[PDB]
């Protein structure tokens, strides 16, 4: 379709330069700092998690018809009695593990659904707490570098 070659090449450029700047440590945007802090906090969370339990990806027996209900249940119990930055990190890592488990077990359809369920939960039930507690900037100060 008209213009898609050109558009795809522009996305490769943007993606490669972004990978390369953040690789060398440079946070250029505001959300770039947040994303970088989130990726690293996710990595640390999972390192501790798997060091204490099994792999976070093995603890989940999920199907497309059943994935939603399972996701909403685990998340609702995770925040049932409070929110904090660490549990928010756990919430991202959980979603990440769901996606990895889905592609590995050949249910790639679930990936962009899980992203939507996460974004909806993040925007409806976590974003008020985040605003009351300094916004993503406070998170970057606590978990970046």
């Amino acid at each position: 379709p008209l213009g898609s070659m050109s558009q795809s090449n522009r996305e490769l450029v943007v993606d490669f330069l972004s990978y390369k700047l953040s690789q060398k440590g440079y946070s250029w945007s505001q959300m770039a700092a947040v994303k970088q802090a989130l990726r690293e906090a996710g990595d640390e969370f999972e390192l501790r998690y798997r060091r204490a339990f099994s792999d976070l990806t093995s603890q989940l027996h999920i199907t497309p018809g059943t994935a939603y209900q399972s996701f909403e249940q685990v998340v609702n119990e995770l925040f049932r009695d409070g929110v904090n930055w660490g549990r928010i990190v756990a919430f991202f890592s959980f979603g990440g593990a769901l996606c990895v488990e889905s592609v590995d077990k050949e249910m790639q359809v679930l990936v962009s659904r899980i992203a939507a369920w996460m974004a909806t939960y993040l925007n409806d039930h976590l974003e008020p707490w985040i605003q009351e507690n300094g916004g993503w900037d406070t998170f970057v100060e606590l978990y970046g570098n």
Binding site: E44, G86, V89
Partner: peptide, 21 residues
């Protein structure tokens, strides 16, 4: 239950994470 145990492991690992910051 099955997912109750999962969210408990997530909850306690996150809390440990939160304290250490």
């Amino acid at each position: 239950g099955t997912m109750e145990n999962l969210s408990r492991r997530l909850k306690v690992t996150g809390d440990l994470f939160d304290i250490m910051s």
